[PDB]
Structure formats: structure tokens, C-alpha cells
Amino acid sequence: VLYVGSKTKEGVVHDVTTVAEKTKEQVTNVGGAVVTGVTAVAQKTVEGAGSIAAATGFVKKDQ
Amino acid sequence: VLYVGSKTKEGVVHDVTTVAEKTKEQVTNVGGAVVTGVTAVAQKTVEGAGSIAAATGFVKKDQ
Amino acid sequence: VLYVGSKTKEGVVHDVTTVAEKTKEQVTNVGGAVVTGVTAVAQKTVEGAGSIAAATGFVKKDQ
Amino acid sequence: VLYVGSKTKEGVVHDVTTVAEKTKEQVTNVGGAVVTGVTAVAQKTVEGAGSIAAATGFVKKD
Amino acid sequence: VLYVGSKTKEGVVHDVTTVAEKTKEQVTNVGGAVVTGVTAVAQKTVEGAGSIAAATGFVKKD
Amino acid sequence: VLYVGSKTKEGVVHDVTTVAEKTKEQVTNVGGAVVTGVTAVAQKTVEGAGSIAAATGFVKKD
């Protein structure tokens, strides 16, 4: 691997705006998962079998 | 691999705007998963068998 | 691996704005998980089998 | 009269959500009644001859 | 009259949410009644002949 | 009359949330009643002939 004057952006996240208003949120959960917020993952490598890279709102009931 | 003066953007995410308003959200969950928010994943590599790269609102009841 | 004058941004996150207002949030949880806030993960490497890189709102009831 | 393991909800009011924007008003009243806002009466019993339960913007020039 | 393991909710009011913006008002009243705001009466019993339970913006020039 | 293991809620008011912005007002009243704010009456019993339970913006020129 050789980079020579090579401006690079390997695996990034940027410029992520969010606006809400008057969001009268009622939420009720029982045993489950709820995700309502901004999430920003940025990885270069996730190696290994059985991996779970960057889940969100995940539920796992493996027997 | 040789990059020579090569402006690169391998695996990126950017410029993601979001606006809501008056969103009178009621949510009820039982055992499941709900996802209502902004999600931004950006990976360069996810290696390995059985992998789950960047799930969202996932449910897994493997026996 | 050889970098030579190569401005690099391997695995980053930036410029993530968020605005809320009057968000009369009621939340009720029983045994589960709720995520409503800003999350920003940025990794270069997550190695190893069975890994869980950057979960959010995760639920795991493995038997 | 008896309840067992029950969930009664006699005479309630809830989740009455209201939103008003720039309601630029010029209310002029003379001798009458003007009602312009939220109102949530919630009762169980009114027992009387000639009574008035839950009036709103009422005029009784009897 | 008896309750067992019950959850009664006789005569309640709740979660009455209100929002008003720039409601630039010019209220002018003469001898009458103007009601412009939130109101949440919540009763159980009113027992009287000729009574008035939960009036609002009432005018009784009887 | 008897309760056992119960959860009674006779005559309540709650979670009455209000928001008002820049409500630039010019209220002018003469002899009448102007009501412009939150109000939360919560009673259980009113027993009297000719009574008035929970008036608001009332005018009784009887």
C-alpha cells in the first residue's frame, strides 16, 4: 500500500443536520428496543466471523 | 495498491439533512424493535462469515 | 504501508448538528432499551470473532 | 354495586391536545359571552331539577 | 357499594396539552364575559336544585 | 361503602400543560369578566340548592 500525495477520506461521516419541533412523543416499551435519536457510525474495518457491526434498534433472542 | 495524487472518497456519507414538525408520535412496542431516527453508517470493510453489517430495526429469533 | 504527503481521514465523524424544541417526551420502559440521544461512534478497527462493534438500542437475550 | 379486578373510567377527559398559531384576534363583546379557549369539563353526576351541568358560552336572560 | 382490586378513574382530566403562539389579542368587553384560556373542571357530584356545575363564560341576567 | 386494594382517582386534574408565546394582549374590561389564564378546578362534592360549583368568567346581574 502506497499513498503519494493522495488526499483520502476512507470511511467517514460528516455534515449531518437534524431539526425537530413540538414532537410530543409518547413512547411505551416492554422488553423490546426503540431508537429515535441520531446515530452516526463510521468504521474502517470490522473483522472476525459472527461479528455485528453497527447495529441499531437490534433485538437478539438466540436460543 | 498505489494512489498517486488521487483524491478519493472510499466509503463515505455526508450532507444528510432532516426536518420534522409537530410530529405527535405515539409509539407502543412489545418485544419488537422500532427505529424512527436518522441513521448514517459508513464502512470500508466488514469481513468474516456470518457477519451482520449495519443492521437497523433488526429482529433475530434464531433457534 | 507507506503514506507520503497524503492528508488522510481514516474513519472519522464530524459536523453533526442537532436541534430539538418543545419535545414533550414521555417514555415508559419495562425490561427493554430506549435510545433517544445523539450517538457518534468512529472506529478504525474492531477485530475478533463474536464482536459487537457500536451497538445502540441493543437487546440480547441469548440462551 | 361492586367491582372486581376491573378498570373503570367513568367521566374522564384526556389527551386533548390543542395548537393555535398567530390567531390574531380582535374580540369585541357587549353583554354577551365569547369563549375562545380550551375547555375540558369532566363530571360523574349532576342531580337537580332545573340545574345546568357544563355550560360554556351561556346566556340566560330568562 | 364496594371495590376490590379495581382501578377507578371517576371524574378526572389529564394530559390536556395546549400551545398558543403570538396570539396578538385586543379583547374589549362591556358587561359580558370573555374566556380565552385553558380551563379544566373535574368534579364527581353536584346535587342541588337550580344549581350550576361548571359554567364558563356564563351570563345570567335573570 | 368500602374499598379493598383499589386505586381510586375521584375528581382530579393533572398533566395540564400550557405554553403561550408573545401573546401581546390589550385587555379592556368594563363591568364584565375577562379570564385569560390557566384554571384547574377539581372537586368531589357540592351539595346545595342554588349553588354554583366552578364558575369561571361568570356574570350574575340577577
Tab-separated table of C-alpha atoms in Angstrom:
chain	number	residue	atom	x	y	z
A	1	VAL	CA	0.000	0.000	0.000
A	2	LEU	CA	1.453	3.334	-1.125
A	3	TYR	CA	-0.283	6.701	-0.884
A	4	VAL	CA	1.616	9.552	-2.558
A	5	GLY	CA	0.036	12.990	-2.248
A	6	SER	CA	-3.384	11.341	-2.220
A	7	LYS	CA	-5.971	13.248	-0.175
A	8	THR	CA	-8.196	10.424	1.066
A	9	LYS	CA	-11.425	10.107	3.064
A	10	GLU	CA	-11.590	6.376	3.816
A	11	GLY	CA	-14.753	5.586	5.762
A	12	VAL	CA	-16.056	8.903	7.098
A	13	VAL	CA	-19.345	10.576	8.005
A	14	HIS	CA	-19.940	14.305	8.136
A	15	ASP	CA	-22.400	17.132	7.631
A	16	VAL	CA	-25.449	15.549	9.259
A	17	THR	CA	-28.044	18.111	10.306
A	18	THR	CA	-31.292	17.393	12.148
A	19	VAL	CA	-34.172	19.605	13.291
A	20	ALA	CA	-37.276	18.596	15.240
A	21	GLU	CA	-40.152	20.627	16.665
A	22	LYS	CA	-43.081	20.226	19.072
A	23	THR	CA	-42.615	16.471	18.783
A	24	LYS	CA	-44.998	15.381	21.540
A	25	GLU	CA	-43.508	11.897	21.685
A	26	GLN	CA	-45.099	9.314	23.922
A	27	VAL	CA	-43.244	6.005	23.911
A	28	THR	CA	-44.091	2.751	25.656
A	29	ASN	CA	-41.833	-0.285	25.551
A	30	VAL	CA	-41.995	-3.749	27.076
A	31	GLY	CA	-38.966	-5.984	26.589
A	32	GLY	CA	-38.182	-4.537	23.158
A	33	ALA	CA	-35.928	-1.814	21.812
A	34	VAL	CA	-36.743	1.653	20.483
A	35	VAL	CA	-34.364	4.067	18.754
A	36	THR	CA	-35.464	7.614	17.972
A	37	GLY	CA	-32.176	9.539	18.032
A	38	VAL	CA	-29.492	10.498	15.549
A	39	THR	CA	-26.864	7.801	15.077
A	40	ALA	CA	-23.638	8.151	13.107
A	41	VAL	CA	-21.259	5.212	12.840
A	42	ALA	CA	-18.100	5.319	10.755
A	43	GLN	CA	-15.727	2.367	10.732
A	44	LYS	CA	-12.726	1.415	8.669
A	45	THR	CA	-12.680	-2.296	9.478
A	46	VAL	CA	-14.752	-4.834	11.374
A	47	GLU	CA	-13.043	-8.203	11.122
A	48	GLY	CA	-13.997	-11.538	12.626
A	49	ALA	CA	-16.739	-14.056	11.976
A	50	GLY	CA	-20.025	-13.758	13.827
A	51	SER	CA	-19.480	-10.004	14.009
A	52	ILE	CA	-22.309	-7.486	14.303
A	53	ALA	CA	-21.000	-4.161	13.013
A	54	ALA	CA	-23.048	-1.086	13.918
A	55	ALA	CA	-26.431	-2.422	14.895
A	56	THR	CA	-29.222	-0.060	15.916
A	57	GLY	CA	-32.607	-0.962	17.326
A	58	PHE	CA	-31.362	-4.536	17.450
A	59	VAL	CA	-33.111	-7.427	19.190
A	60	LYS	CA	-31.472	-10.838	19.537
A	61	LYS	CA	-33.199	-13.799	21.201
A	62	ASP	CA	-30.858	-16.569	20.055
A	63	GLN	CA	-31.648	-19.952	21.593
B	1	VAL	CA	-2.185	-0.689	-4.356
B	2	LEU	CA	-0.784	2.673	-5.461
B	3	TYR	CA	-2.566	6.015	-5.183
B	4	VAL	CA	-0.716	8.905	-6.843
B	5	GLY	CA	-2.342	12.319	-6.496
B	6	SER	CA	-5.739	10.621	-6.463
B	7	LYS	CA	-8.340	12.475	-4.387
B	8	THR	CA	-10.519	9.611	-3.158
B	9	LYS	CA	-13.732	9.232	-1.144
B	10	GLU	CA	-13.840	5.493	-0.422
B	11	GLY	CA	-16.981	4.642	1.535
B	12	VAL	CA	-18.322	7.931	2.905
B	13	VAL	CA	-21.629	9.550	3.845
B	14	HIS	CA	-22.274	13.269	4.011
B	15	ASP	CA	-24.776	16.066	3.543
B	16	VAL	CA	-27.794	14.426	5.175
B	17	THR	CA	-30.419	16.943	6.257
B	18	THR	CA	-33.645	16.165	8.112
B	19	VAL	CA	-36.549	18.327	9.288
B	20	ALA	CA	-39.628	17.260	11.247
B	21	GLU	CA	-42.524	19.238	12.704
B	22	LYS	CA	-45.432	18.776	15.125
B	23	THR	CA	-44.916	15.032	14.802
B	24	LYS	CA	-47.268	13.886	17.562
B	25	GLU	CA	-45.730	10.422	17.670
B	26	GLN	CA	-47.272	7.798	19.893
B	27	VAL	CA	-45.371	4.515	19.845
B	28	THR	CA	-46.163	1.235	21.567
B	29	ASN	CA	-43.864	-1.768	21.424
B	30	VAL	CA	-43.970	-5.247	22.921
B	31	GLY	CA	-40.913	-7.436	22.398
B	32	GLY	CA	-40.168	-5.948	18.976
B	33	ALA	CA	-37.960	-3.183	17.640
B	34	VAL	CA	-38.830	0.282	16.345
B	35	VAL	CA	-36.495	2.743	14.622
B	36	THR	CA	-37.649	6.282	13.877
B	37	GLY	CA	-34.386	8.251	13.934
B	38	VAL	CA	-31.730	9.268	11.445
B	39	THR	CA	-29.069	6.612	10.934
B	40	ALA	CA	-25.859	7.024	8.950
B	41	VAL	CA	-23.441	4.120	8.645
B	42	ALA	CA	-20.296	4.289	6.543
B	43	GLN	CA	-17.882	1.370	6.483
B	44	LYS	CA	-14.879	0.477	4.395
B	45	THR	CA	-14.778	-3.240	5.174
B	46	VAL	CA	-16.805	-5.822	7.059
B	47	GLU	CA	-15.050	-9.164	6.770
B	48	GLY	CA	-15.950	-12.525	8.250
B	49	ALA	CA	-18.660	-15.076	7.594
B	50	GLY	CA	-21.938	-14.839	9.466
B	51	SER	CA	-21.445	-11.079	9.677
B	52	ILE	CA	-24.307	-8.603	10.008
B	53	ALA	CA	-23.052	-5.249	8.738
B	54	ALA	CA	-25.137	-2.211	9.680
B	55	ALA	CA	-28.495	-3.602	10.665
B	56	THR	CA	-31.314	-1.287	11.721
B	57	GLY	CA	-34.676	-2.249	13.142
B	58	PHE	CA	-33.381	-5.805	13.230
B	59	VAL	CA	-35.081	-8.735	14.955
B	60	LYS	CA	-33.392	-12.126	15.264
B	61	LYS	CA	-35.070	-15.123	16.913
B	62	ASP	CA	-32.697	-17.851	15.732
B	63	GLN	CA	-33.430	-21.258	17.245
C	1	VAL	CA	2.130	0.673	4.315
C	2	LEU	CA	3.636	3.976	3.170
C	3	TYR	CA	1.947	7.370	3.374
C	4	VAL	CA	3.895	10.179	1.687
C	5	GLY	CA	2.363	13.642	1.961
C	6	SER	CA	-1.081	12.042	1.985
C	7	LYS	CA	-3.650	14.002	4.001
C	8	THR	CA	-5.921	11.221	5.253
C	9	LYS	CA	-9.165	10.966	7.237
C	10	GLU	CA	-9.387	7.245	8.019
C	11	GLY	CA	-12.571	6.517	9.955
C	12	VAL	CA	-13.832	9.864	11.257
C	13	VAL	CA	-17.102	11.591	12.133
C	14	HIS	CA	-17.644	15.328	12.231
C	15	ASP	CA	-20.060	18.186	11.690
C	16	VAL	CA	-23.140	16.659	13.316
C	17	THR	CA	-25.703	19.267	14.328
C	18	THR	CA	-28.971	18.611	16.158
C	19	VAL	CA	-31.824	20.873	17.269
C	20	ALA	CA	-34.953	19.925	19.209
C	21	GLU	CA	-37.807	22.007	20.604
C	22	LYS	CA	-40.752	21.668	22.999
C	23	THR	CA	-40.339	17.906	22.743
C	24	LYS	CA	-42.751	16.873	25.496
C	25	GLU	CA	-41.312	13.369	25.678
C	26	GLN	CA	-42.951	10.828	27.926
C	27	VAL	CA	-41.144	7.492	27.953
C	28	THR	CA	-42.045	4.265	29.719
C	29	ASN	CA	-39.832	1.196	29.651
C	30	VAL	CA	-40.051	-2.252	31.203
C	31	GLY	CA	-37.053	-4.535	30.749
C	32	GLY	CA	-36.229	-3.127	27.313
C	33	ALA	CA	-33.931	-0.448	25.955
C	34	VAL	CA	-34.688	3.019	24.595
C	35	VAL	CA	-32.267	5.384	22.858
C	36	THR	CA	-33.312	8.942	22.041
C	37	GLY	CA	-29.996	10.818	22.102
C	38	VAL	CA	-27.287	11.718	19.625
C	39	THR	CA	-24.696	8.981	19.188
C	40	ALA	CA	-21.455	9.269	17.233
C	41	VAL	CA	-19.117	6.295	17.003
C	42	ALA	CA	-15.946	6.339	14.932
C	43	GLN	CA	-13.615	3.352	14.946
C	44	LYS	CA	-10.618	2.341	12.906
C	45	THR	CA	-10.630	-1.363	13.746
C	46	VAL	CA	-12.748	-3.856	15.652
C	47	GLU	CA	-11.085	-7.250	15.437
C	48	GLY	CA	-12.095	-10.560	16.962
C	49	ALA	CA	-14.871	-13.042	16.318
C	50	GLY	CA	-18.160	-12.684	18.151
C	51	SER	CA	-17.562	-8.935	18.304
C	52	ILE	CA	-20.356	-6.376	18.563
C	53	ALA	CA	-18.993	-3.080	17.253
C	54	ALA	CA	-21.001	0.030	18.123
C	55	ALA	CA	-24.408	-1.249	19.092
C	56	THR	CA	-27.171	1.162	20.080
C	57	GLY	CA	-30.575	0.320	21.479
C	58	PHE	CA	-29.381	-3.270	21.639
C	59	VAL	CA	-31.182	-6.122	23.394
C	60	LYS	CA	-29.593	-9.553	23.776
C	61	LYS	CA	-31.370	-12.475	25.456
C	62	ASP	CA	-29.064	-15.288	24.346
C	63	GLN	CA	-29.909	-18.646	25.907
D	1	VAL	CA	-72.947	-2.428	43.181
D	2	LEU	CA	-69.463	-3.926	43.275
D	3	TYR	CA	-66.351	-4.096	41.094
D	4	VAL	CA	-63.751	-6.880	40.996
D	5	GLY	CA	-60.434	-6.713	39.146
D	6	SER	CA	-61.970	-4.039	36.927
D	7	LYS	CA	-60.644	-0.857	35.305
D	8	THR	CA	-63.445	1.715	35.207
D	9	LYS	CA	-63.058	5.103	33.522
D	10	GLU	CA	-66.324	6.895	34.286
D	11	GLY	CA	-66.408	10.518	33.173
D	12	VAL	CA	-62.858	11.372	32.122
D	13	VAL	CA	-61.164	13.600	29.560
D	14	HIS	CA	-57.626	13.135	28.346
D	15	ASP	CA	-55.075	13.639	25.593
D	16	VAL	CA	-56.954	16.741	24.473
D	17	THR	CA	-54.114	18.350	22.526
D	18	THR	CA	-54.510	21.796	21.002
D	19	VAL	CA	-52.275	24.026	18.883
D	20	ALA	CA	-53.062	27.550	17.713
D	21	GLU	CA	-50.808	29.831	15.684
D	22	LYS	CA	-50.820	33.627	15.235
D	23	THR	CA	-54.546	33.657	15.932
D	24	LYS	CA	-54.520	37.443	15.739
D	25	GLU	CA	-57.859	38.216	17.353
D	26	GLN	CA	-59.887	41.359	17.940
D	27	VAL	CA	-62.702	40.257	20.230
D	28	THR	CA	-65.432	42.776	20.987
D	29	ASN	CA	-68.213	41.819	23.360
D	30	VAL	CA	-71.223	43.661	24.767
D	31	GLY	CA	-73.446	41.891	27.261
D	32	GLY	CA	-72.699	38.513	25.706
D	33	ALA	CA	-70.253	35.664	26.144
D	34	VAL	CA	-67.258	34.872	23.947
D	35	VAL	CA	-65.325	31.664	24.601
D	36	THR	CA	-62.146	31.207	22.607
D	37	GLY	CA	-60.009	28.746	24.573
D	38	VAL	CA	-59.719	25.103	25.508
D	39	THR	CA	-62.247	23.747	27.989
D	40	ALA	CA	-62.469	20.262	29.464
D	41	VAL	CA	-65.361	19.625	31.835
D	42	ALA	CA	-65.430	16.084	33.211
D	43	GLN	CA	-68.109	15.070	35.677
D	44	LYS	CA	-69.836	11.997	37.015
D	45	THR	CA	-73.178	13.123	38.417
D	46	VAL	CA	-75.417	16.192	38.422
D	47	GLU	CA	-78.793	15.616	40.078
D	48	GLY	CA	-81.007	18.668	40.438
D	49	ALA	CA	-84.206	19.895	38.876
D	50	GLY	CA	-83.555	22.880	36.652
D	51	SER	CA	-79.788	22.572	37.026
D	52	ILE	CA	-77.201	23.324	34.341
D	53	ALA	CA	-74.267	20.933	34.023
D	54	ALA	CA	-71.334	22.133	31.905
D	55	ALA	CA	-72.464	25.324	30.254
D	56	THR	CA	-69.998	27.192	28.042
D	57	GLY	CA	-70.733	30.451	26.299
D	58	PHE	CA	-74.116	30.500	28.002
D	59	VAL	CA	-76.517	33.449	28.137
D	60	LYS	CA	-79.590	33.129	30.361
D	61	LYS	CA	-81.586	36.359	30.117
D	62	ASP	CA	-84.613	34.495	31.488
E	1	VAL	CA	-71.043	-0.360	47.145
E	2	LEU	CA	-67.580	-1.905	47.272
E	3	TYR	CA	-64.459	-2.135	45.111
E	4	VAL	CA	-61.898	-4.957	45.051
E	5	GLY	CA	-58.568	-4.852	43.218
E	6	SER	CA	-60.055	-2.175	40.969
E	7	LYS	CA	-58.677	0.974	39.327
E	8	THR	CA	-61.440	3.584	39.192
E	9	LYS	CA	-60.997	6.952	37.481
E	10	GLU	CA	-64.241	8.795	38.212
E	11	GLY	CA	-64.269	12.410	37.069
E	12	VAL	CA	-60.702	13.205	36.031
E	13	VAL	CA	-58.962	15.389	33.460
E	14	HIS	CA	-55.425	14.865	32.270
E	15	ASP	CA	-52.852	15.310	29.528
E	16	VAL	CA	-54.682	18.429	28.372
E	17	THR	CA	-51.808	19.981	26.428
E	18	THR	CA	-52.148	23.420	24.872
E	19	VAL	CA	-49.870	25.600	22.748
E	20	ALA	CA	-50.602	29.126	21.544
E	21	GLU	CA	-48.305	31.358	19.508
E	22	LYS	CA	-48.261	35.150	19.029
E	23	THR	CA	-51.990	35.237	19.704
E	24	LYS	CA	-51.911	39.022	19.479
E	25	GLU	CA	-55.248	39.853	21.068
E	26	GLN	CA	-57.236	43.029	21.619
E	27	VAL	CA	-60.078	41.984	23.900
E	28	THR	CA	-62.777	44.548	24.621
E	29	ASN	CA	-65.585	43.650	26.987
E	30	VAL	CA	-68.576	45.544	28.361
E	31	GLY	CA	-70.838	43.826	30.856
E	32	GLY	CA	-70.129	40.426	29.333
E	33	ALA	CA	-67.725	37.547	29.810
E	34	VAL	CA	-64.729	36.695	27.637
E	35	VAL	CA	-62.844	33.467	28.329
E	36	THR	CA	-59.661	32.949	26.355
E	37	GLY	CA	-57.569	30.475	28.355
E	38	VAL	CA	-57.335	26.836	29.320
E	39	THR	CA	-59.896	25.536	31.799
E	40	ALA	CA	-60.173	22.066	33.301
E	41	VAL	CA	-63.089	21.490	35.661
E	42	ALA	CA	-63.214	17.962	37.066
E	43	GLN	CA	-65.920	17.006	39.526
E	44	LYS	CA	-67.697	13.969	40.879
E	45	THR	CA	-71.032	15.152	42.252
E	46	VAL	CA	-73.227	18.252	42.219
E	47	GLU	CA	-76.620	17.737	43.861
E	48	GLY	CA	-78.793	20.822	44.183
E	49	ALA	CA	-81.966	22.081	42.592
E	50	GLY	CA	-81.261	25.036	40.347
E	51	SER	CA	-77.502	24.680	40.745
E	52	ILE	CA	-74.890	25.374	38.068
E	53	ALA	CA	-71.988	22.940	37.787
E	54	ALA	CA	-69.025	24.080	35.677
E	55	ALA	CA	-70.102	27.274	33.993
E	56	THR	CA	-67.598	29.089	31.780
E	57	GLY	CA	-68.279	32.342	30.006
E	58	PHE	CA	-71.670	32.453	31.687
E	59	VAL	CA	-74.030	35.436	31.785
E	60	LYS	CA	-77.120	35.177	33.995
E	61	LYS	CA	-79.069	38.432	33.712
E	62	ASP	CA	-82.129	36.622	35.081
F	1	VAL	CA	-69.148	1.717	51.094
F	2	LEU	CA	-65.709	0.123	51.252
F	3	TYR	CA	-62.580	-0.170	49.108
F	4	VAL	CA	-60.060	-3.028	49.084
F	5	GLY	CA	-56.720	-2.985	47.269
F	6	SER	CA	-58.157	-0.306	44.989
F	7	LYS	CA	-56.725	2.810	43.330
F	8	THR	CA	-59.449	5.457	43.159
F	9	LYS	CA	-58.950	8.804	41.423
F	10	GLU	CA	-62.171	10.700	42.122
F	11	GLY	CA	-62.140	14.305	40.949
F	12	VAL	CA	-58.558	15.041	39.923
F	13	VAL	CA	-56.775	17.177	37.343
F	14	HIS	CA	-53.239	16.594	36.175
F	15	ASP	CA	-50.646	16.979	33.444
F	16	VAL	CA	-52.424	20.114	32.252
F	17	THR	CA	-49.520	21.609	30.310
F	18	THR	CA	-49.802	25.040	28.726
F	19	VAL	CA	-47.483	27.170	26.596
F	20	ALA	CA	-48.157	30.695	25.359
F	21	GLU	CA	-45.819	32.878	23.317
F	22	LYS	CA	-45.719	36.664	22.806
F	23	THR	CA	-49.449	36.810	23.462
F	24	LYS	CA	-49.315	40.591	23.207
F	25	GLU	CA	-52.647	41.484	24.771
F	26	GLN	CA	-54.592	44.692	25.285
F	27	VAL	CA	-57.460	43.707	27.561
F	28	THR	CA	-60.125	46.315	28.247
F	29	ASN	CA	-62.959	45.476	30.605
F	30	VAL	CA	-65.929	47.425	31.948
F	31	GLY	CA	-68.228	45.759	34.447
F	32	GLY	CA	-67.560	42.337	32.955
F	33	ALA	CA	-65.200	39.428	33.468
F	34	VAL	CA	-62.206	38.516	31.316
F	35	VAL	CA	-60.370	35.266	32.043
F	36	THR	CA	-57.185	34.687	30.092
F	37	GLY	CA	-55.139	32.200	32.122
F	38	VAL	CA	-54.962	28.566	33.119
F	39	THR	CA	-57.554	27.323	35.595
F	40	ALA	CA	-57.889	23.871	37.124
F	41	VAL	CA	-60.824	23.355	39.474
F	42	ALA	CA	-61.007	19.840	40.906
F	43	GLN	CA	-63.739	18.944	43.359
F	44	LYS	CA	-65.566	15.945	44.728
F	45	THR	CA	-68.890	17.186	46.074
F	46	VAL	CA	-71.041	20.317	46.005
F	47	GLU	CA	-74.448	19.864	47.633
F	48	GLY	CA	-76.579	22.982	47.919
F	49	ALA	CA	-79.726	24.274	46.302
F	50	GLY	CA	-78.967	27.200	44.036
F	51	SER	CA	-75.215	26.793	44.456
F	52	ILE	CA	-72.580	27.427	41.788
F	53	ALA	CA	-69.711	24.949	41.541
F	54	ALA	CA	-66.723	26.030	39.436
F	55	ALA	CA	-67.745	29.225	37.721
F	56	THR	CA	-65.204	30.985	35.507
F	57	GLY	CA	-65.829	34.233	33.702
F	58	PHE	CA	-69.227	34.407	35.366
F	59	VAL	CA	-71.544	37.424	35.427
F	60	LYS	CA	-74.649	37.227	37.623
F	61	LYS	CA	-76.550	40.508	37.303
F	62	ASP	CA	-79.643	38.753	38.670
